[PDB]
Design a protein around this ligand. Structure first.
Ligand code: NA
Ligand SMILES: [Zn+2]
Length: 117
């Protein structure tokens, strides 16, 4: 229950929000606001506005990467963990006020954020 079946594509980027990626394949299935790696790129740049709130950023950056450019190997994408999502709710509370969290970034969505892996 910590992986999801999907088709893998070749990464067009070797970096997510400044972090070098140790894998070469991904999928867009977890990011319901993106149908291409180009859209995901754009959406992440938009999210990088939270760099100005380091306490939020330190926890949201690894989350965003796990949702927008997750590792895909052998027809399977790795799901972000519960602890990963939860740690972001308080320090990134401003997101709820400004725009809200979309379905695929709500910690409640157990299908997307299983405990614990
Ligand atoms: Na998508
Ligand atoms: Zn490859």
């Amino acid at each position: 229950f910590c992986k999801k079946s999907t088709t893998c594509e070749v990464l067009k980027y070797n970096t997510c929000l400044g972090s070098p990626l140790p894998y070469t394949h991904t999928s867009l299935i977890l990011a319901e606001d993106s149908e291409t790696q180009e859209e995901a790129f754009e959406k992440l740049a938009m999210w990088s506005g939270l760099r100005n709130a380091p306490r939020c950023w330190a926890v949201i950056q690894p989350l965003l990467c796990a949702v927008y450019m997750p590792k895909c190997e052998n027809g399977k994408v790795e799901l972000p963990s519960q602890h990963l999502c939860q740690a972001t709710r308080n320090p990134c509370s401003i997101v709820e006020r400004e725009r809200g969290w979309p379905n695929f970034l709500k910690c409640e969505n157990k299908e997307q954020f299983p405990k614990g892996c």
